[PDB]
Chains A and B, each alone.
With several copies, the nearest count.
Chain A
Amino acid sequence: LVPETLLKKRKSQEKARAERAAAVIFKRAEKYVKEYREQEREKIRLARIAKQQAKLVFVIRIKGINKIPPKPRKILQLLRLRQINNGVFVKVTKATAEMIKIVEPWVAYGYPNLKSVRELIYKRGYGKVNGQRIPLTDNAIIEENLGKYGIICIEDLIHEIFTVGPNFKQAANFLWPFKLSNPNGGFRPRKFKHFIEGGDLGNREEHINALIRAMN
């Protein structure tokens, strides 16, 4: 009986228990006609965007049209915005601006401030190691996952994200998409209501920070 591996086994079991604890209807003809008109409007808008042809933005997936065209679906695939209330950081280039303009009816995006970036990474920060969601509870995870790029701490990660450094792609890919909460869930008469209502298209600029503060 080696006490070192006994204590190591006890610790491994305790942290395992800790992470386990921490972890057809009828369709209306009006619905059919509305869905066709939505798809024809989306097709016209996408055709117009395709015919027409570095900052930091925060993008939150919101509820929009139920049927999504394949090109916005693929852009949501690469932007990791499948579920509602998922948030990501995006470096603003020409290609990313075109993607954001394409998926505008399903997103709410803007310019996050330093407080929003810091609070998002500190309070809801998860990294993707081995394809798994690991909370950022120490600087060691960042050191062994992004230490080849000179990023050895959470503050280095925040610096890369906020200043949009050379390794912004690596930092944002390491960061898991943020799962933001619904403030309407705390009140029973508005329990089913979505927090962000669609319709306010375009850049919200610095007003995305109100949404981030409310939902983070």
Chain B
Amino acid sequence: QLALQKIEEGDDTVLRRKQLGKFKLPEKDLELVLPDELEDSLRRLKPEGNLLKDRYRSMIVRGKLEARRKIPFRKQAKTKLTEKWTFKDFRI
């Protein structure tokens, strides 16, 4: 029974549970034209998705780099303002 229990391309839509980087990758956005938005010409086609985001997701999924979040503001060096000696010693 133990032996039979031991005996018994990748898809980017179903990812593994463990993260690579600061967070697990979110589910992809819905790339589907709804029936109310269907058009009959190439000119009126509304393209779906984001190809730059697709390339970034492809590189993260294939493991060339890890998923990181943007840091909009970094911590500043803690400083203290003081008046210069020449401006302190100015007399009039």
Contacts and interface: CB of A to CB of B under 8 A. Distances in A.
Interface of A: 4, 7-8, 10-11, 14, 18, 137-140, 143, 152-153
Nearest to B53: A18
Contact of A138 (B29, B36, B45): B45
Contacts of A8: 34, 36
Interface string B12-42: 0000000000000000011010111000000
Contacts of B30: 7, 10-11, 14
Given A14-B29, A18-B50, A143 B34 contact: no
B32, B34, B47 — most chain A CB neighbours (10 Å): B34
A138 B47 contact: yes
B47 A11 contact: no
B88 interface: no
Interface residues of B, number: 12
A209 to B, nearest CB: 27
B44 A139 contact: yes
Nearest to A17: B29
Given A14-B29, A14-B30, A18-B50, A153 B35 contact: no
B75 interface: no
B34 A152 contact: no
B29 A152 contact: no
Contacts of B44: 138-140, 143
Contacts of A137: 46-47
A201 to B, nearest CB: 41
A145 to B, nearest CB: 14
A159 to B, nearest CB: 14
Contacts of A14: 29-30
Given A14-B29, A18-B50, A153 B43 contact: yes
A4 B43 contact: no
B34 A4 contact: yes
Given A7-B34, A14-B29, A138-B46, 16 more contacts: A4-B34, A4-B35, A4-B36, A7-B30, A8-B36, A10-B30, A11-B30, A14-B30, A18-B29, A18-B50, A137-B46, A137-B47, A138-B45, A138-B47, A139-B44, A140-B46
